[PDB]
Amino acid sequence: IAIPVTQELICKCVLDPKNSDILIRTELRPEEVWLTWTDKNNEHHEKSVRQLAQEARAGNAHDENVLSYYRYQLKLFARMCLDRQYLAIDEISQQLGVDLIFLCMADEMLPFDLRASFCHLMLHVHVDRDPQELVTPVKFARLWTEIPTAITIKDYDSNLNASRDDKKNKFANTMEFVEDYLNNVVSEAVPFANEEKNKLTFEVVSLAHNLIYFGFYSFSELLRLTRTLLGIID
Amino acid sequence: VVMETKLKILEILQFILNVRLDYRISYLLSVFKKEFVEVFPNLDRIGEQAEAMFGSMLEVDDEGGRMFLRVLIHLTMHDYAPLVSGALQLLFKHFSQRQEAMHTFKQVQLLISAQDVENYKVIKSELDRLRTMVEKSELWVDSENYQIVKGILERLNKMCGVGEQMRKKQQRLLKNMDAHKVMLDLLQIPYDKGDAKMMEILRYTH
């Protein structure tokens, strides 16, 4: 459970501009994501995540250390923003965009651990803002005019779609990626075999659960995802 | 990590089963409305329609429910306590669909009168505004927001109204909108002693 006091102090201290050197900066350039950092001395390194992962797989020490620092920093950012401590998610959202995190997470060449960290940040930064709220599934109150003469599944989600105020959902592509990932993992003969992949699977499952509880999904999509979830379970 | 995701999947399934109940309630109300409008611009037909759904597109799995019980039993056989508790709860709820559906259907309000429509609209608007302000309580706990909240609370207090039958109907309606959750959340708002406006709004909430 988040501790507001110490969280606020760390928010005001680590994000303070004087301490910006320790924080690695990721930027999307014409697109590809590039990481910029500074060594212990006064030299600045600018590279890209793809080559970093390739060299880490090869066995280069510096690449592995930099990648480890980046994932742990991402974990620290995700932990900082827990419980809607807005003073931080404002800065994090400005620094890290939805599209940038989507690009980093969706691509497969990156290590599973980094993808899991990105998923955690995505869930605890952008999904957990407050243009949303928990949606009660069953609503006792119903209007005599709203009740249609004939109701089907599509007609049922039509009213929910109309109620939604977001003409273009900002997380729709995230839902698509979640669906593809779950389809791939269920398609695999052994859904839970690789230890590293388990972290990413748990992360995407948590992201999906929080997305569903906010009313993003539709009844037909809910049923399809339910079938896939039952498949992965057994 | 492998067990927590299973528990989360169980939670997803538990929530997704409620929207099925909502759809069933909507279908029952639609059948009612069709029957009522047709007869007055029958009981056996609507009874047959209501019985048909309960036991097939709404099925959780394509296997007819066997898969759902299979995973529930397998999870129940595991050692994790929360996972087994969730599996047992789902198993029991799976074989009591009709009882829960009828029990929830009995507690349904139609809001046919125009007056009821106006109360619904105004209450929903005020609840949304108050919830939005409460979610950002930390900003204004220690102004325009204070007077806005006070006005909303006073408007709701006047909205309560008078009349035994009107009182009961309005109380049921407010319970349907779940306004008591907003009230309780506002009561638990962080407070600093010595703020007259905060005490005034707290008194209005009480």
From Swiss-Prot, chain A:
Compartments, as annotated in UniProt: Endoplasmic reticulum membrane; Cytoplasmic vesicle, Secretory vesicle membrane
Origin: domain of life: Eukaryota
Coiled coil: none
PTM notes: Phosphorylated by AKT1 on serine and/or threonine residues.
Residues that hold Ca(2+) 1 according to the record: R84
Tissue expression as described in the entry: Expressed in intestinal crypt and villus epithelial cells.
Associated disorder: Charcot-Marie-Tooth disease, demyelinating, type 1J: An autosomal dominant demyelinating form of Charcot-Marie-Tooth disease, a disorder of the peripheral nervous system, characterized by progressive weakness and atrophy, initially of the peroneal muscles and later of the distal muscles of the arms. Charcot-Marie-Tooth disease is classified in two main groups on the basis of electrophysiologic properties and histopathology: primary peripheral demyelinating neuropathies (designated CMT1 when they are dominantly inherited) and primary peripheral axonal neuropathies (CMT2).
Summary of the function given for this chain in its UniProt record: Inositol 1,4,5-trisphosphate-gated calcium channel that, upon 1D-myo-inositol 1,4,5-trisphosphate binding, transports calcium from the endoplasmic reticulum lumen to cytoplasm, thus releasing the intracellular calcium and therefore participates in cellular calcium ion homeostasis.
Family note: Belongs to the InsP3 receptor family.
UniProt note: domains: Composed of a large N-terminal cytoplasmic domain (CD) followed by a juxtamembrane domain (JD) and a transmembrane domain (TMD).
Assembly, per entry: Homotetramer. Homodimer. Interacts with TRPC1, TRPC3 and TRPC4. Interacts with TRPV4. Interacts with SIGMAR1. Interacts with PML and AKT1. Interacts with IRAG2 (via coiled-coil domain). Interacts with CABP1. Interacts with TMBIM4/LFG4. Interacts with CEMIP. Interacts with TESPA1. Interacts with TMEM203. Interacts with BOK; regulates ITPR3 expression. Interacts with BCL2L10. Interacts with CHGA and CHGB.
Protein name in UniProt: Inositol 1,4,5-trisphosphate-gated calcium channel ITPR3
Organism: Homo sapiens (Human)
Classification of source organism: Eukaryota, Metazoa, Chordata, Craniata, Vertebrata
Span covered, complete protein: 643 to 893 of 2671
Swiss-Prot record, chain B:
Family: Belongs to the InsP3 receptor family.
Tissues with expression: Expressed in intestinal crypt and villus epithelial cells.
Lineage top rank: taxon: Eukaryota
Disease the record associates with this protein: Charcot-Marie-Tooth disease, demyelinating, type 1J: An autosomal dominant demyelinating form of Charcot-Marie-Tooth disease, a disorder of the peripheral nervous system, characterized by progressive weakness and atrophy, initially of the peroneal muscles and later of the distal muscles of the arms. Charcot-Marie-Tooth disease is classified in two main groups on the basis of electrophysiologic properties and histopathology: primary peripheral demyelinating neuropathies (designated CMT1 when they are dominantly inherited) and primary peripheral axonal neuropathies (CMT2).
Entry's localization field: Endoplasmic reticulum membrane; Cytoplasmic vesicle, Secretory vesicle membrane
Domain comment quoted from the record: Composed of a large N-terminal cytoplasmic domain (CD) followed by a juxtamembrane domain (JD) and a transmembrane domain (TMD).
Reported modifications of this chain: Phosphorylated by AKT1 on serine and/or threonine residues.
Quaternary structure annotation from Swiss-Prot or TrEMBL: Homotetramer. Homodimer. Interacts with TRPC1, TRPC3 and TRPC4. Interacts with TRPV4. Interacts with SIGMAR1. Interacts with PML and AKT1. Interacts with IRAG2 (via coiled-coil domain). Interacts with CABP1. Interacts with TMBIM4/LFG4. Interacts with CEMIP. Interacts with TESPA1. Interacts with TMEM203. Interacts with BOK; regulates ITPR3 expression. Interacts with BCL2L10. Interacts with CHGA and CHGB.
Source organism of the structure: Homo sapiens (Human)
Function according to Swiss-Prot or TrEMBL: Inositol 1,4,5-trisphosphate-gated calcium channel that, upon 1D-myo-inositol 1,4,5-trisphosphate binding, transports calcium from the endoplasmic reticulum lumen to cytoplasm, thus releasing the intracellular calcium and therefore participates in cellular calcium ion homeostasis.
Binding site for Ca(2+) 1: E135, E138
Complete-protein stretch covered: 963 to 1229 of 2671
Name of the protein this chain belongs to: Inositol 1,4,5-trisphosphate-gated calcium channel ITPR3
Gene this chain is encoded by: ITPR3
